[PDB]
Symmetry: D2
């Protein structure tokens, strides 16, 4: 795993997944140089997709990409048995990897997380991206735990790290001997300087070419040029979290006239104050 | 809503729900004076129950209780369509009310929270208990949002408040359109002192009788007698969070030889260290 | 220690301590039922008094009170040498107790705190009220450290507890080593329910009579009547922290035409937005 | 401007008194090793536990010993505005090159209170001023909007030592401020420079000045492959520097290495036996013994 992997939105139309818009979105991202696509993660609205829709979206992404970039299937759950069914499906349907979130809400212990991901890792042969986002899940996947997992299971391959405490990123790089992927667009630059190898990205849905450029300069070690793009995208990056992801990214795509449509409850339209702000940021970049 | 409402565990035996054990537990609680039972909440491991088991547990609680005390059924979800469907089922199956958790993990705005709970309120005629636990969900249901909800829908009746900042409870009581139930055993006494009317409780699975008396003292305004049971049980209350609920409560029940059985992954067995502490707490109380 | 001790403001006039206003304020609070006076704490702007103003304000409080009620002198500092000096001064000048805050900013360890408070307790024969407020000091004085202090030093007699996690208060009460005084006006009712014996108060500066009545109702165990006043005063109690104390309380006292005067930098006049909220709260109470 | 590595020097004590000879010897050690400047009597220097007179004499000793070879930044912050002015005026009068000025701690002023506070400091002197933000100690966060107003009004508001570990605060400063950002966290120094910061005010540069200077110069020149190598080699040491509250670990470490430090002043006190051993092993691993 290296470079930019947009966490793609799931577009909706007439209350159903918009499979055609999906294809068009995927092809857009591929023309602009992304290394891969993460299907049905948080930005894909996994919580509000039926079991059956989650499967059809993954299959659609696998079928459209048709090997041109890595397809990473969202397969996390806070129920271990479900995380297994999903991971096995991702392998069977032809995904190249699995993104597996730490169980949210039920708050397992570190031993719980170890056991949980261990089952997941044993269930499939695919590379697994562990996904840590304490601010949403109420649990922090500790580096020592990842080190144990990584040393037991060769397919445990990377961490998408969205803990904003970057000394966790140092511990992972130093002790854990795992690939770190940024889980926060705005921390991608400093995480890559730390040893990080890429990013699973929200904003790359909107500006894939520029984000790909930025990340490529950061990987090459050209931070002067990376910073230039970072600072240019900086207001857009802030606007991506002006309300909870994916409310902003879908709003922005609608404003640009790209496929996205409605958010599913309990997610809902941005405030007007917030819209105008995003509106202005998009205008400043000449995106609309 | 008034008094002690144990949030019951879901006992397991041979990877299946222990229906006889459930029945044994319910009658134990009823016989010790609880006002009602909360089925398949987070203490009942709802995250790791199948859709089928969820419905079967609630049906069994309804049928065993047989109108004797209130049955409040867990029916929340971070997907609104799923919340509506669970709530409809609880009504159709004969439950007296619905416990509805704020969407966890996807972090809806206050407006999205209001829309989510509105859809739930509109789907059923049963009284609804809203459930706020920011330390698990990563979202705080604000008192002004409860106020707007209780104003719009007459079946929005109570809030199980587990926010540990008791100014939020004072604000709920002040902006007075709902009954406040303690969502934390150890804060039950000060929450009733503030004007709370009961508790949805973990510890009441273990010491139903004593907790019922404490609460009744607090409700009567006799805090000297209430404090005396609070303090007797204080070490027990702490041990109930020595690891993530329901790990300790199930552990404790197994210890006492009562129906409980295993935890489902990613929840797992307590530390040897932590069990020793729990064991000793239990022993000092003559429960083992 | 029992009942209501206002932490009095230090009024200023023409850039100097307003000793007459001070006298007038003290007399007003005594006439309206307070149990004592806390001089030159945080609410009295101790960080912005010179060393000589600090000693003078305390001397004046001692002199005006003239033994009528207990005088508790702010002493204490994040430098142990200064804390001893301040404490020995309080004794020499005729105060009845000392209020001693945990060192702020320099973050000593629990062992550091024990040694700091030990040196203070050895330096004087007066009773000492420990002051814990992690939200300001960046340090939490653990109940086990209090237990240890109280066991070694018989003049460590109380803790002013401003940690809003009321489990910490339950722990302090369970050890029964020490009197608990509320450090937060709005948590006074629930803290007394838990076994607290009173409050070091901000809002008592504004409504001494009403707050004294609330607190006595609570100490007698009449929570029905305690609740009535707590809810009557709730919007005021919130207004008291709408910005950092003592900016609201001095603002309210000036609006009321009582001695208070200017705030010393870095504290400064409240926002116009916050002034409007406070003024309406004072008007609702008939205080302006 | 401010650039490169500025250690926040300890104040060494001998027999309950500031150890001036030890202080001199520490200063020359750091200068020998290529530091850009010295930060005197900040938190690492136990500013809370020094007398007024010790504070003054310590800054005086630092100015004199340094003798213009490197920049001297004098800690002169207080949570009392009148005292912050006084300390600042003194730093200028005595010959320091710059003032470090911490957001008032404990009393929790509002943003506007902070602006007015730093405004009075800035009006009091002509020295460049480094604003120090460290919410984990002060209970307050100086917002980039507030820094931007300061810098727009006062030409001598020159840098921020940023110890807030939320690094998008750092990119908000780089993006909006026009102030120099200095790292306030040894372990975040490398990612802060990547974001465009220009150096660090450092605890660990007291122990390994030559290594830190060179890691920083690599990160400054944009050679992150080599910055990373030194960052990870020092990573256990950087964590040890906060194993207990700074400056407990750094002084414990200097004493272990037989360099001037001596005792901590209450309420600071000796490290636990368990923490001592962890520190010792990391010192042993780097061969600092």
């Amino acid at each position: 795993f290296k470079g930019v992997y947009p966490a793609i939105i799931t577009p909706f139309k007439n209350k159903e997944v918009d499979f055609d818009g999906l294809e068009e979105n995927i092809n857009f991202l591929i023309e602009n140089g992304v290394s891969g696509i993460v299907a049905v993660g948080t930005t894909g609205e996994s919580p509000t997709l039926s079991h059956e829709e989650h499967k059809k979206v993954i299959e659609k992404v696998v079928d459209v990409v048709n090997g041109r970039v890595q397809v990473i299937a969202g397969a996390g759950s806070n129920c271990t048995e479900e995380a297994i069914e999903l991971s096995v499906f991702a392998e069977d349907v032809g995904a190249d990897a699995v993104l597996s979130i730490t169980p949210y809400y039920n708050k397992p212990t570190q031993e719980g997380l170890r056991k949980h991901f261990g089952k997941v890792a044993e269930s499939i042969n695919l590379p697994i991206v562990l996904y840590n986002v304490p601010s949403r899940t109420a649990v922090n996947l500790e580096p020592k735990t990842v080190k144990l997992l990584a040393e037991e299971y060769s397919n445990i391959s990377a961490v998408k790290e969205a803990n904003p405490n970057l000394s966790q990123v140092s511990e992972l790089i130093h002790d854990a001997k795992i690939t770190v992927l940024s889980g926060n667009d705005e921390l991608t630059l400093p995480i890559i300087a730390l040893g990080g190898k890429g990013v699973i990205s929200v904003v790359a849905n909107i500006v894939p070419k520029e984000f790909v450029e930025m990340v490529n300069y950061a990987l090459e070690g050209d931070f002067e040029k990376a910073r230039e793009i970072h600072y240019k995208l900086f207001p857009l990056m802030k606007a991506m979290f002006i309300e909870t992801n994916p409310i902003p990214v879908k709003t922005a795509l609608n404003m640009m006239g790209r496929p996205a449509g409605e958010l599913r409850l309990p997610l809902c339209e941005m405030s007007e104050e917030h819209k105008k702000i995003l509106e202005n940021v998009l205008k400043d970049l000449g995106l609309i």
